[PDB]
């Protein structure tokens, strides 16, 4: 059960109601969604190697400043040669998980026709 429930995007079939609002409510859960493959990642990252695409940060930084961060995080984030996976999206879901008090399923049968 664990191999399939908590790993596939066919996890919504057990927990329907996922939506994209760009964040998380106070007390909800935040779901990241990714893919795999080296050739696929190399194809998806193609736009971030263009000189005309990269020039954008210098156009922005004339007027507005960006949040700072530790140098090691920024150093790790710039090595694009050996990468196996990439984040594609995120979804919102408005409730936390119990995580205790084990579950016992209760089964009912449907009535017989006449």
């Amino acid at each position: 059960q664990i191999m399939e429930l908590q790993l596939f995007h066919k996890f919504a079939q057990n927990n329907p109601g996922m939506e994209h609002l760009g964040g998380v409510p106070k007390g909800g859960t935040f779901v990241l969604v990714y893919v795999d493959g080296r050739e696929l990642v190399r194809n998806l990252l193609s736009a971030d190697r263009d000189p005309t695409y990269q020039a954008r940060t210098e156009v922005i930084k004339k007027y507005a400043s960006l949040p700072p961060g530790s140098p090691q995080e920024l150093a790790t984030s710039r090595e694009l040669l050996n990468r196996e996976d990439i984040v594609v999206g995120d979804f919102c879901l408005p409730y936390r998980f119990s995580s205790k008090t084990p579950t016992v399923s209760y089964v009912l049968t449907q009535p017989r026709p006449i």
């Binding site: 995007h9 996890f11 106070k26 990241l32 193609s46 736009a47 007027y63 949040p67």
Partner: protein, 326 residues
């Protein structure tokens, strides 16, 4: 205008199903087929805004040709994103593009509900009904008179100077609203930066029920030009450099995280921005550490799209029963 939801599946009747997202290509189709119809709705609705502004009683009458070029701009930007005027765009941005379109509709609504209540008549014309008053159409015998309507079709309705009922303020709001709608729909408003230039950030804001003026300014917008002209009241007070947003302007005495250090009473939503494009373990760990640093409340989960999945778990009771057999 209306906007469809993500998983929309054509059927009789149609449904919303996420059980069809088996791999990546289904994800791309599922977002493309919704962005197309949203763009078509925008094209059908926007070019007719000039109908809210009366030619006789408003002082401001916009030109109709402002929104005739949206269809082509939007289709070009979409075909640029998907099929990876022409520009270079990253594909993993598609989910944001959808959201961007949605915001446009919201701005539209924020306008149309306000201008509905305006009455200005800055310069009267004294030769409209010089010495007579027209009353409405005479109803059928023994029928009840109309008592709820404000404006009968052929009746000489009341019109006033732009002083009373607070109109002296609405006469301004609508302008400041219309102009914003013109600035959002411009060639360089959708403006992303390379993913390794944007560190993680979480910024608090209000939920989607609030008016567009009260929400935080999204991360994927061209801030230096839109940070003015976002919301009217903040403009009046001179606080437009302090609205919740990812960036902050140069040369203003602004604390880097001034919003997350003081009290949080009137916020219920957290916008989490800066993670798209990065690896799994790194993004997950950075989010957990941020949550630890600033004392926030939510959970984080990670899932993989696919159907292959290329383990052991700590079960207390199974290990307890296994410990007495060896």
């Amino acid at each position: 205008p209306q906007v469809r939801r993500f998983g929309y599946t054509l059927e009789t009747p149609p449904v919303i199903r996420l059980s069809n997202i088996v791999d990546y290509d289904a994800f791309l189709k599922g977002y493309q087929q919704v962005c197309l119809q949203a763009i078509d709705e925008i094209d059908r609705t926007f070019p007719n805004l000039f109908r809210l502004f009366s030619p006789f009683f408003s002082s401001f009458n916009p030109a109709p040709s402002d929104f005739t070029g949206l269809k082509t701009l939007l289709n070009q930007r979409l075909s640029d994103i998907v099929s990876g005027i022409s520009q270079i765009e990253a594909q993993y941005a598609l989910q944001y593009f959808y959201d961007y379109l949605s915001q446009l509709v919201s701005a539209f609504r924020e306008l149309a509900e306000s201008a509905f209540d305006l009455m200005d008549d800055a310069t009267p014309d004294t030769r409209r009904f010089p010495k007579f008053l027209m009353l409405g159409l005479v109803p059928l015998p023994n029928q009840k008179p109309e008592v709820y309507a404000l404006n009968s079709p052929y009746r000489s309705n009341f019109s006033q100077s732009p002083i009373y009922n607070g109109n002296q303020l609405r006469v301004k709001q609508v302008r400041f609203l219309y102009d914003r709608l013109v600035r959002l729909c411009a060639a360089d408003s959708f403006y992303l930066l390379p993913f390794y230039d944007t560190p993680l950030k979480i910024t608090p804001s209000k939920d989607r029920a609030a008016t567009l003026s009260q929400q935080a300014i999204p991360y994927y917008l061209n801030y230096p030009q839109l940070y003015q002209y976002w919301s009217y009241d903040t403009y009046r007070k001179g606080r437009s450099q302090s609205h919740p947003a990812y960036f902050y302007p140069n040369n203003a005495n602004i604390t880097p995280n001034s919003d997350l250090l003081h009290r949080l009473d009137d916020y219920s939503f957290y916008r989490i921005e800066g993670h798209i494009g990065e690896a799994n373990a790194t993004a997950l760990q950075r989010i957990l550490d941020y949550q630890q640093r600033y004392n926030l409340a939510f959970d984080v989960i990670t899932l993989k799209i696919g159907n292959l999945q290329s383990i052991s778990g700590q079960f207390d009771d199974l290990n307890a029963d296994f410990g007495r057999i060896k």
